Amino acid sequence: TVTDIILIHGALNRGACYDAVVPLLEARGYRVHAPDLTGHTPGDGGHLSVVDMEHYTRPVADILARAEGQSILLGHSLGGASISWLAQHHPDKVAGLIYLTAVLTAPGVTPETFVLPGEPNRGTPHALDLIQPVDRGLQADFSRLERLREVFMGDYPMPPAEHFIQTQSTVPFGTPNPMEGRALEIPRLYIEALDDVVLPIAVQRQMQKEFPGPVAVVSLPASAAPYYSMPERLAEAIADFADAPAEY
Template structure:
């Protein structure tokens, strides 16, 4: 039995993993899929959110898990959270899994990586600042065409209706990672070939920036928990330390 801790991406909540959580539990594993503190909060609450605060929150969950070390997985923006959490508590993390996620090296922020990438006009057209500027919102019609175009339409529309305000601070914060802590933990990157939010070329660039990461590939959109839940659950199970050590070279 493994404990999986699943960290959601921007604008989402732990609910996005519901189908994958059920599949992992049916396979005999423990699963936590928390909502990160401050999501959807007031301007004051959004302003108080920090990347380190989120990392400490997740690190504490890892330390308290019933079976250790855990498999810590992050989707999209959740990648920067699991990296910083693993740096804080490497002894409690047996494996890291980045699900079409921001896997960045030491000293880089989500914002600086994005600034170095080609413009993504489709993505930019759906993102608007909150009234006070301490967060962002997904606006516009049919965001599922960006986030979940390969997912079942009803599930995609329901998910888009649950998106909330995202704090701005974490994406502006540079990661502080070290080879002996974050760098010592086995990493798997689950790339999604039809992702319109973080295109495949960007996912591959991040893998090149963090050498030594194992790659798994899904024919999925940016919401593989909706479009490929069984396959995503299989990728997570394949990333456990026991499964990796048993796999043929």
């Protein structure tokens, strides 16, 4: 039944960020994908090209279309707003959702609800401090490289440029979760990064607790990027979920 595993990057990242994890899942017998979202491939136009969530997620819709069977969608950090949106529109194509220290927001709730300071257990003030506006775009603050590294990339045994883009579209921050009806019947899994300081473990829990209905959860002892510090443990739980998502 489950045929493809689709891994989806966070803000300012690219598909390639998952390089270490892809062949581990492939060994578990899956067609594994790590596409760039719209605006995330150098030479494609960048952040102003992204019209809306449909346009931003099209490279994932396209893959799901050629899928022989069912798919698991994984989102990292900001990626969770992409897989919630896709779930609404292709629930026939999706068998399961993985939120990897990602943004899981209740129906009709935007991700910014949890980036901005607020109560209870809201705010990502490390990221607001290191990611800055430009033009409608967001971009890291390159005057503080070591800070950029300990905060966003401390799990890397720095990463290579293939893993990143310069400018991020604001589209997925302001677009609210459209999941209704069948989409809420998809099994949901949240993988926590317990030592994350981008998205504090308290915010992660506040998001699991605020989503209507059950969320299965696995806890990883990682920081903002578990695909760097522990690909093997991560793939394993990803494949244990794709082996039978209704019962994990």
